[PDB]
Amino acid sequence: CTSSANLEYIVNKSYTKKIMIVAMKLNKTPDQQRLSLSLIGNLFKHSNAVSLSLIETDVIDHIILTFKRAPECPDILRHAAL
Amino acid sequence: MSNTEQVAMMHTLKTKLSKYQAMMDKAFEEIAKVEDANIIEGCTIVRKLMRKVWNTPKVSADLANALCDYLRDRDYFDKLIKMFISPNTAACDQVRMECGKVLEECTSSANLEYIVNKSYTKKIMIVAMKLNKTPDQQRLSLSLIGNLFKHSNAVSLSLIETDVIDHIILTFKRAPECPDILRHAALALANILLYTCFEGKKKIIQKKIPEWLFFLASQADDVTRYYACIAVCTIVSVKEFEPLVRKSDTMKLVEPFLQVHDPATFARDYHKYAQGNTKEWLERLLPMLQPSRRREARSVAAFHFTLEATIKKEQNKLDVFQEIGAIQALKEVASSPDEVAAKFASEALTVIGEEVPYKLAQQVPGWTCADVQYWVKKIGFEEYVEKFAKQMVDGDLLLQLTENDLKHDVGMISGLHRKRFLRELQTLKVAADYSSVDESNLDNFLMGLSPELSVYTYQMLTNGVNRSLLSSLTDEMMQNACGITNPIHRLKLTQAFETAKHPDDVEVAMLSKQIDVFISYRRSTGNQLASLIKVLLQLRGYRVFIDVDKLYAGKFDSSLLKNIQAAKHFILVLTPNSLDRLLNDDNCEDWVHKELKCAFEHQKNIIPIFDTAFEFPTKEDQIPNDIRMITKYNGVKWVHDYQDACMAKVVRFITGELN
């Protein structure tokens, strides 16, 4: 459901960082990790200010650790590279 | 205007630009000291300068624009923004005020675009919401807020997320003592509605802004009313929201508000606020002239374009209406039965110095064959016009035209052409005024069921039907004599006389399902409070009727008393002086007396609402004997500070608990 308008809705309602942190909590399995990197990457399809604001979460380190943990899943590497 | 004047303007512009750049620098040197009084004084000078610039007879807009550019180029604009949003400004709120006032003057389209490009928008918005401690702060706040709302749909929608609409509502609810607050509120609402998408409009409606626009349009201030009329007509321009505005009653204020003004006189009144009206904001108003829109919206748009034509004559930029093509739409409206809009559109074209096409009267039965010819022409049936002329068709005969008459006497062989033609004729039939002939207000009655039914008006009227007879009609009479072949329409009329045997009994039965509460008040004193009460009750879901829309000289609406009879509940807003015109009114000449007498005659859950300053008249024996008893009733003391509790008490009197 991460349409441009749905990502805009997330931003408009300021759910962005809540969703981000909860995506960072989705880490327990490769499925969680893939979904996490997906939602993370999807939030990164909003405008410059939003991406910059999300850099302040240091999720980049979480991303690195996530793909570094489970590179044996191509879908993790996809959602990371995405 | 001459090329000598173009030169003189350019010269004056360059000259005064040079001057005001230097003076602005001096004021910016005071700001750049970063000391309270110096920032205040510098900003005061810039404010005075910008207003004087806007008051400069001809070059005003260009000079303002050039100075807005200079302010960006000098980073003066950027510095003001930064100094305005600074938290340290709490050292002296008057610094924030003067910075903000200057920013308000300097909110040109390019300056607002700069704000958006630098992403200052929400910072400024929040700091405007913090400007709340005085009516001055509140006015400035509403100003900056409204100015931000003069920018593209996404920005307005983004700002809706701040819930500033509730802050706006609370601000004018707190301080209705200030007309300028109501102006900047109505401005903000007009701007945001004009500069937002469907989704944002829906959100604004969810803040029940149609009700608040009733309140705003019921203010005594013509500038507030103008903006409120624009704002509601912007809403009314969308089909889905017409019922919501109908429930607000606000449309009913619109045409009367226009009728009591001349656009050029209002332009001269409005000028200080007209300064900085914009092309794109006109381009967004242009759709409100369209034949798809309400008569109200077209009338507001036409009046507004007359006002703009006036102001653009003064600024010598009438070319804008050619650039946006509005001249064509004005000609279309001038050649329309939207008589009010047509007049204003003709006047607009007059101020543009354009031709005024042939006028059309809403009283279409009165039409000459020349009128018919012109109409037929305009609706594109030009090839038949000669035959219409030969057939000598008039305002009467047009209204009778069956397909056969077209087929044979007009020789219109194409059934499709006939269909097309008849669609226009039906439209016209609906649109037409039949007060020319309708002694019985049958048309009004039918309109109350649905205006759609007005198609049948002329037929029935000419067949000798009147409002009193309607209960007695059979399906056959309806079908045949009234030509109502549509059984659904026949069913509708059946549903009228299913309820009762007499049109007044039927209408009072209907009206009961449209009126919970009737509000009586004294027009010269109670207007604002009565409207606030109406709006607050409408926000609480109650269907409220009120006498706001001015009746003419004499000729009182007895249907006002039918509205009271249909109501469950009756409010009397007891202002200072509220009962004074009832004194010695034994003949019940006062309409407040007629209203209150009717309320007593029907025991409508009767609610005296005492305004905060109110006292009863000195001499109770001089209040007429029939209504004097009201001096013994319980009522709600209104308190402006405790509006919510007072309204809770009003609800108790409505639920019959305290009366």
Next chain:
Amino acid sequence: YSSVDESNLDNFLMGLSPELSVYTYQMLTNGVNRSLLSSLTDEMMQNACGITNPIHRLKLTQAFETAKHQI
């Protein structure tokens, strides 16, 4: 039809069965709305709404068959 359909009659008809969308504009332009449908006779439907197909009339009939239920 949302351009003109205040009542979401279009939506209703689609939900009832998609093909019935075909009738929307006729009945809408005759001044029918989502509330009134309960009140129509087979005759009114067949004539005014031009739904000559009795099967279609039966379908919408099923909607109206089913659109019910100190001392």
